[PDB]
């Protein structure tokens, strides 16, 4: 089954995009990242940055994640990320969400040899 680190990547990562282009930009990552699939995943951020920048997380400032893990890091610089939140109107199967666009910094989880991201905990 997919790795915890391929699941960020597929969940978080969006290296291809310096930011959201417009505001369906997370309607339609959403989807294709099949994060709606079985149903409407509430929250989600998008990271615009390298692979090799998220995963370089792993080794900046320790904090405790929000569960209390001690795994937590705070990267050292902002980011750019899209927030997506579903809107009122989100049902199944047809969810929906409200798109910001930010720069701030994010907070993971990291696990394993290579030691990468594994969970984004939250951006500050």
Partial sequence: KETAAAKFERQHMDSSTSAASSSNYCNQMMKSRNLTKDRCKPVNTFVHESLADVQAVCSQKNV?????????????????????????????????????????????????????????????
């Fill in 64 to 124: 405790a994640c929000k569960n209390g893990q001690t795994n937590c890091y705070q990267s050292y610089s902002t980011m750019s990320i899209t927030d997506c939140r579903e809107t009122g109107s989100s049902k199944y199967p047809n969810c929906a969400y409200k798109t910001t666009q930010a720069n701030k910094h994010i907070i993971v989880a990291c696990e394993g040899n290579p030691y990468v991201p594994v969970h984004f905990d939250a951006s500050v």
